[PDB]
C-alpha cells in the first residue's frame, strides 16, 4: 500500500509562504529519501532537493537554496517543503517522490510519486465550481459542465472512477478571472438511464466534492 | 550542472513502428559509487511521471519488453519497439549521479493513425443553471483525427463568434484520437429571447459540416 499523499492544491498570496506536505504510508519513512520536483504548466521537470528523513540531512539544488526549505516529521511520517517569498513564477505543480532505499544502491530511482500539489500564487480568493449535468443511436453521450471556479485544478471522475472508458475531460478555460471545464462520457444507449451515471467533481482548493447524477 | 539534452522534442510515430529517443549528458554521469544513474520516465497526460528504465538499461518491474535502454559515456537511447497507443506521453531522461540531479527537456511521443470523423453532440443549458441566471450551450466534438477542426455556432440561422470558449484534449491513450469542447455562454435573458441553437463542425474527413441543433 505504498503511497505519498499530497494535497491537490494550495492557494497562497504573492510575497507570502506556503508549506507543502507529503504524507508517507505503507513503508518505513526513515529508510528512503524523499525528493521534491517542480513542474511548470506545459513544461519539464526540475529537481529541487531531497531529505533523508532518518537524520534530516538535506541536499538542495543551489537554484532553490533561498526558495525552498525541506523538513521531515518522523512521528507523522510526513515530509514538508516550504516555499517562501512567493512570486507568480512559483505557480506550478510540485511532486514529492520516493527516491531510493538507503542500503541498496541499485534501486536509487523515483519509484513512487506523490499525486502532485498545484500551487497557485494569487491574491484572489477561492471560488468553488458550480456543476451542471448535461443530458440529452447505438451510443449516448452525457456530460458535466464545471463552471466558475478558482484556482486550478478540478478532477472529474464518473461513477467514482468505475466508469473510465469513453471519458473525455477537457482542459479548463479562464474567463473573467474564473475557470470552466467540461467532461463527456459515452456509454451504450441501452444502459442509460437504466444504469445510473454520475459525475464526481473535486475542487481541492475549496476542499469540495460535488456528485451530480445525470437524469434524462 | 549536468545538462541533459533530449532529441527530439516531439516525435510522431505510426502504430507498430519503432521509436527512438536520444539523451546526451554534457559530462559523464558515473556516480562515485560506480553506478550510472540514468533513468527514463514516462508522464502521461494528467498523471505523475512513472519509472520505465533505470541504470541505463534495466527495465523496471512491470514495464513491457518493447522498451529498451542503452548507451554509455554521454549518449543514451530509449527504443520503443512496436509502438502502441498506450505509449503516448512525454518521455524524460534523468541523471541521478551528480547534484543537482537533472531531467532532459522531454520528448512528446505522438501517434499517427487513420482519419476519423468527429462525433458531435449538443446540449442545452441545464434547468439548474437557468435557475442561477446563466445559460451555457455545450457542444462536444469527439474522437476525431487529425487534430485540426473548425466549429461554428448559429442562433436562429445567424453566426455568433462572441461568447464562445473552446478546449482541446490531449491525444487519447486508447484510440489515438483528439476531442474538442465548445461552450457558448449567454445570459439567461438572451437565451430565452431565441429558440434555435446550432453547433456545426468542419473537419478534413468531409466537405460538408456535421451539424447538431435543438429548439428551446
Amino acid at each position: 500500500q505504498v503511497q505519498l499523499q499530497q494535497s491537490g492544491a494550495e492557494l497562497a498570496k504573492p510575497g507570502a509562504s506556503v508549506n507543502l506536505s507529503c504524507k508517507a504510508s505503507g513503508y518505513t519513512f526513515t529508510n528512503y529519501w524523499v525528493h521534491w520536483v517542480k513542474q511548470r504548466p506545459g513544461q519539464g521537470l526540475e529537481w529541487i532537493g531531497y531529505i533523508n528523513p532518518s537524520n534530516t540531512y538535506i541536499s538542495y539544488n543551489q537554484q532553490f537554496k533561498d526558495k525552498a526549505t525541506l523538513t521531515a516529521d518522523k512521528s507523522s511520517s510526513t515530509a514538508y517543503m516550504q516555499l517562501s517569498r512567493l512570486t507568480y513564477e512559483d505557480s506550478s505543480v510540485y511532486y514529492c517522490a520516493r527516491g531510493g532505499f538507503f542500503y541498496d544502491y541499485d534501486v536509487w530511482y523515483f519509484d513512487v510519486w506523490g499525486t502532485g500539489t498545484t500551487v497557485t500564487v494569487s491574491s484572489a480568493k477561492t471560488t468553488p465550481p458550480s456543476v451542471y449535468p448535461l443530458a440529452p443511436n447505438s451510443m449516448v453521450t452525457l456530460g458535466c459542465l464545471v463552471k466558475g471556479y478558482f484556482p486550478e485544478p478540478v478532477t472529474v471522475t464518473w461513477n467514482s472512477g468505475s466508469l473510465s472508458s469513453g471519458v473525455h475531460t477537457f482542459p479548463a478555460v479562464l474567463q473573467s478571472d474564473l475557470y470552466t471545464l467540461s467532461s463527456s462520457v459515452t456509454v451504450p444507449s441501452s444502459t442509460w438511464p437504466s444504469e445510473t451515471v454520475t459525475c464526481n467533481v473535486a475542487h481541492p482548493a475549496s476542499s469540495t466534492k460535488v456528485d451530480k447524477k445525470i437524469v434524462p | 550542472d549536468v545538462l541533459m539534452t533530449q532529441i527530439p522534442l516531439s516525435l510522431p510515430v505510426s502504430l507498430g513502428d519503432q521509436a527512438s529517443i536520444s539523451c546526451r549528458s554534457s559530462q559523464n554521469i558515473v556516480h562515485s559509487n560506480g553506478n550510472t544513474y540514468l533513468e527514463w520516465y514516462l508522464q502521461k497526460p494528467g498523471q505523475s511521471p512513472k519509472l520505465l528504465i533505470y541504470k541505463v538499461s534495466n527495465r523496471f518491474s512491470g514495464v513491457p519488453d518493447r522498451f529498451s535502454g542503452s548507451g554509455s559515456g554521454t549518449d543514451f537511447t530509449l527504443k520503443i519497439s512496436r509502438v502502441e497507443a498506450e505509449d503516448l506521453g512525454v518521455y524524460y531522461c534523468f541523471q541521478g549521479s551528480h547534484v543537482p540531479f537533472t531531467f532532459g527537456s522531454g520528448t512528446k511521443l505522438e501517434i499517427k493513425r487513420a482519419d476519423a470523423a468527429p462525433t458531435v453532440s449538443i446540449f442545452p443549458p441545464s434547468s439548474e443553471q437557468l435557475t442561477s441566471g446563466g445559460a451555457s450551450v455545450v457542444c462536444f466534438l469527439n474522437n476525431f483525427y487529425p487534430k485540426d477542426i473548425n466549429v461554428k455556432w448559429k442562433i436562429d440561422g445567424s453566426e455568433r463568434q462572441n461568447g464562445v470558449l473552446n478546449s482541446w484534449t490531449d491525444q487519447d491513450s486508447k484510440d489515438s484520437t483528439y476531442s474538442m469542447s465548445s461552450t457558448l455562454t449567454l445570459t439567461k435573458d438572451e437565451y430565452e429571447r431565441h429558440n434555435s441553437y446550432t453547433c456545426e463542425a468542419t473537419h478534413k474527413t468531409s466537405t460538408s459540416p456535421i451539424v447538431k441543433s435543438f429548439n428551446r
Partner: peptide
C-alpha cells in the same frame, strides 16, 4: 551511525 548519501556525503 553513518549513511552513504546520494550526493556523496556521509550523514
Amino acid at each position: 551511525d553513518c549513511i552513504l548519501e546520494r550526493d556523496g556525503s556521509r550523514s
